[PDB]
């Protein structure tokens, strides 16, 4: 109601000729009275007779050039009597009732269009009732003003998306009501389309090129997130709009996958022409997920159900990759809540950035393939009767999950703990392993470390006996060789 | 001693209020031309609402010497300078009405009267007075609205406020010197 | 039926042939203004009244003046008429004289101004209460302050209310 009363108090109008002619009316009709008040300033020169009279007189530039003190009077106090006593004067007092009557007629007319003007404002009373209904409790009461000016102009209120932690650019929400009793969702860009216009979900897609190593034939399979193509978000229903707001949250989430795109740019795995980036990794040549440096997931396709083993795995990717940047969205807020400056400006060294989509690629590919290859090299030590085992032991030694210890604070401790158990996933370097012998007893051991998908294998070995002898060394070519040297210094 | 002290007793008083309604109109006239932007709907009502008030004081200032001035009725005789360029004198000394007088007729004719004389006219006066007396009835109804009220200091403070746990300044004084906070 | 009321035009060219050059000017004004009602003309007619010979019988050392007359000071035949006018209209007190309905003038070069008045006298003051009329090129002006104000004043306001009516903008 207040906003709408303020709108009527903003002079505002978009009229061509209509708006134009009216303001010209003001100019001339106001100017008239301005100019006639200047005859009033001419009566001022009419005084003359005094110096303060001259002051008043200079009122006309023509008085500046018409020197005279000019005028003189006599007495008709009798004529004052005639003005007052005349039958004409009695009658003229009737011109007082007459003009005053027509003024009262005007008054009545103005007054009535006023209650009908309050009736267009009841459209708004209803809109506020509509807003009272629907989206409520926890939710944005963002109050905004646009169309510039800074005062008056256009002003209203609503919620938006990013909040705690900072993606950074073009992130928010803005909401208004149509005459169909439905709410239209503005975004301050992401340009309106009641509960959106066009929506892009993040999407995913994983290909494998095998052919049993036959013709370089690659197929994909994609974990699909489609609630439906049919849209409801009913008019007059903010509850359905709350659902549309949840859709809006998902759209804001895709913006996060844009940061992951950029975080790819720090790696050697596909980004082609600077116009499209493709996620892909060497082994069995396979590909996992995508979204063009142009965008992510934009909706228009045929709809059939068939699945595929690639497809099942692919849904696992999206949730991880998605999840992984909630982590980022979390360790950002750790710093913010925790220390003064704030976190702003996001992932220097692409250390913070890299986590998203960088550690997943690493994880899958590196530790795993390299461990497999280490195992073949450990088959070069496959020769002795022997034995040799792997643990989470390196993993156990650092980066504990859900520990009671906490940090500085009770409030701080909780969030730190939340980070930790999810932190396993983000930390995913290879654990490492060992092998041993007894009978006057010897012992050796190796650790696989991924540092950014590059693989180090650092080993150890001690032969425990009456007098102690030992060596430790920290590349895969040398590892093969070290194993050959170990055979000689072992039993054989 | 040669020529005369003619008139203009409250003339200065008219001039002052003549000017203020000129001054407030003139300024609105200057802005009225920058139709590029209107001054803020508050601003124009501040200037055009005290600019209308200016003409109330200028309206009344006319009646207050109103017996005196119609009686004075000065028409000019002057320097011959006034005679050359002529009109300025016809213009500057002329009272009439504009196209204005006409909606004055529209209004006069809008009333229920015109040529029916004195006895019937005196009666209409008593009748309009009766309308004003039926307007007093507004006084009676205003009593019903019955709305007039007010917004011992100590009596009211107990209800209202107990605010302050201590002296801010003294607290600090202590932290810095070990001077200890005394009763405030 | 319409009135020219609060002074209007002249009577022009009609005693421009009879010729206006002061003194005669006053009489020309009389016809023109349609405003000589009693005394000045009455003085004119009584002398003008004799029309050769029917029967019409009824009774009917220099420098001294009025204060305004002393300020004015009259030059030529109109000065002689002035004596006649005093004679026509003079209520008499000890050191004083008052007039009824005389019409008279004050002038310069191309134009003048004239009043029709009543004088009240005394040793140290004397005032004439009258009507005043200015007279340039066959036109007469008779005007009133307070009436003068109501003029472009009501005009200012009706035009301000046109302005206020125009504030019918959003």
């Amino acid at each position: 109601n207040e906003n709408g009363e303020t709108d009527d108090n903003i002079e505002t109008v978009m009229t061509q000729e209509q708006f134009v002619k009216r303001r010209r009316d003001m100019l001339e009709h106001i100017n008239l009275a301005m100019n006639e008040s200047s005859l009033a300033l001419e009566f001022v020169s009419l005084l003359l007779s005094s110096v303060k009279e001259s002051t008043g007189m200079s009122s006309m530039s023509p008085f500046l050039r018409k020197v005279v003190k000019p005028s003189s009077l006599n007495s008709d106090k009798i004529p004052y009597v005639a003005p007052t006593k005349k039958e004409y004067i009695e009658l003229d007092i009737l011109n007082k009732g007459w003009k005053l009557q027509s003024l009262n007629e005007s008054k009545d007319l103005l007054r009535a269009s006023f209650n009908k003007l309050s009736s267009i404002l009841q459209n708004e009373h209803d809109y506020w009732n509509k807003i009272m209904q629907s989206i409520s409790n926890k939710d944005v009461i963002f109050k905004i003003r646009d169309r510039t000016s800074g005062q008056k102009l256009l002003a209203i209120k609503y919620g938006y998306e990013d909040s705690g932690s900072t993606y950074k650019h073009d992130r928010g929400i803005a909401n208004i009501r149509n005459n169909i009793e439905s709410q239209n969702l503005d975004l301050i860009p992401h340009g309106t389309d009641f509960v959106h216009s066009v929506k892009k979900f993040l999407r995913v897609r994983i290909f494998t090129k095998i052919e049993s190593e036959d013709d370089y034939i690659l197929s994909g399979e994609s974990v699909m997130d489609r609630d439906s193509e049919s849209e409801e978000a009913e008019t007059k229903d903010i509850r359905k709009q709350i659902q549309l707001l949840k859709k809006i949250i998902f759209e804001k989430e895709l913006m996060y996958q844009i940061k992951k795109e950029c975080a790819l740019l720090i790696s050697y795995g596909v980004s082609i022409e600077n116009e499209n980036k493709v996620i892909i990794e060497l082994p069995n040549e396979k590909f996992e997920i995508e979204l063009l440096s142009l965008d992510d997931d934009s909706i228009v396709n045929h709809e059939q159900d068939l699945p595929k083993i690639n497809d099942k795995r692919a849904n696992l990717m999206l949730v991880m990759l998605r999840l992984l940047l909630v982590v980022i969205f979390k360790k950002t807020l750790r710093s913010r809540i925790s220390s003064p400056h704030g976190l702003i400006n996001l992932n220097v060294d692409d250390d913070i950035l890299i986590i998203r989509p960088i550690l997943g690629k690493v994880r899958f590919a590196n530790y795993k393939l390299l461990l497999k290859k280490i195992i073949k090299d450990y088959v070069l030590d496959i020769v002795p009767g022997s034995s040799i085992t792997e643990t989470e032991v390196e993993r156990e030694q650092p980066q504990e999950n859900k520990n009671i210890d906490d940090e500085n604070i009770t409030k701080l401790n909780k969030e730190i703990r939340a980070f930790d158990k999810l932190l396993n996933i983000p930390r995913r370097e290879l654990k490492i392993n060992l092998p041993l012998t007894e009978h006057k007893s010897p012992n050796l051991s190796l650790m696989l470390e991924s540092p950014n998908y590059c693989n180090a294998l650092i080993h150890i070995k001690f032969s425990a006996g009456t007098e102690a002898n030992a060596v430790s060394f920290d590349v895969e070519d040398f590892l093969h060789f070290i194993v050959a040297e170990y055979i000689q210094q072992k039993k054989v | 001693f040669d020529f005369n002290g003619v008139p203009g007793q409250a003339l200065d008083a008219v001039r002052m209020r003549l000017a203020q309604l000129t001054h407030s109109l003139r300024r609105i006239r200057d802005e009225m031309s920058k139709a590029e932007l209107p001054q803020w709907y508050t601003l124009q009502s501040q200037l055009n609402v005290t600019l209308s008030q200016l003409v109330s004081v200028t309206s009344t200032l006319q009646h207050f010497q109103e017996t005196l001035d119609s009686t004075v009725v000065y028409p000019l005789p002057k320097f011959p300078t006034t005679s050359h360029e002529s009109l300025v004198t016809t213009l500057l000394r002329k009272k009439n009405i504009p196209e204005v007088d006409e909606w004055m007729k529209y209004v006069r004719e809008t009333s229920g009267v015109t040529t029916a004389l004195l006895k019937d006219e005196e009666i209409e006066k008593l009748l309009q007075q009766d309308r004003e007396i039926t307007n007093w009835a507004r006084t009676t109804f205003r009593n019903e609205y019955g709305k007039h009220d007010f917004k011992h200091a100590s009596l009211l403070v107990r209800d209202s406020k107990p605010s302050k746990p201590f002296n801010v300044d003294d607290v600090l004084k202590f932290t810095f010197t070990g001077e200890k906070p005394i009763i405030t | 039926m319409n009135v020219t009321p609060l002074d209007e035009l002249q009577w022009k060219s009609p005693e421009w042939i009879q010729v206006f050059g002061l003194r005669t000017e006053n009489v020309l004004d009389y016809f023109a203004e349609s405003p000589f009602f009693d005394k000045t003309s009455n003085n004119q007619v009584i002398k003008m009244q004799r029309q050769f010979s029917q029967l019409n019988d009824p009774n009917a050392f220099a420098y001294v003046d009025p204060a305004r007359r002393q300020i004015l000071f009259k030059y030529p035949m109109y000065m002689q008429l002035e004596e006649e006018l005093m004679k026509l209209d003079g209520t008499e007190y000890v050191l004083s004289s008052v007039r009824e309905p005389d019409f008279w003038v004050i002038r310069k070069q191309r134009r003048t101004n004239n009043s029709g008045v009543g004088s009240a006298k005394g040793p140290e003051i004397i005032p004439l209460q009258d009507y005043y009329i200015i007279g340039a090129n066959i036109y007469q002006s008779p005007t009133i302050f307070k009436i003068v104000q109501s003029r472009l004043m009501s005009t200012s306001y009706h035009l301000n209310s046109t302005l206020e009516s125009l504030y019918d903008l959003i």
């Binding site: 200047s38 300033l41 | 001054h23 213009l91 002329k94 504009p98 | 002249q10």
Partner: peptide, 25 residues
Amino acid sequence: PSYSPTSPSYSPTSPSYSPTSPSYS
């Protein structure tokens, strides 16, 4: 004190204040 200088506008081209009737003989 009041403003500063006094706002000219002087005008003989306005609507009109004089009528006209006392000619014909």
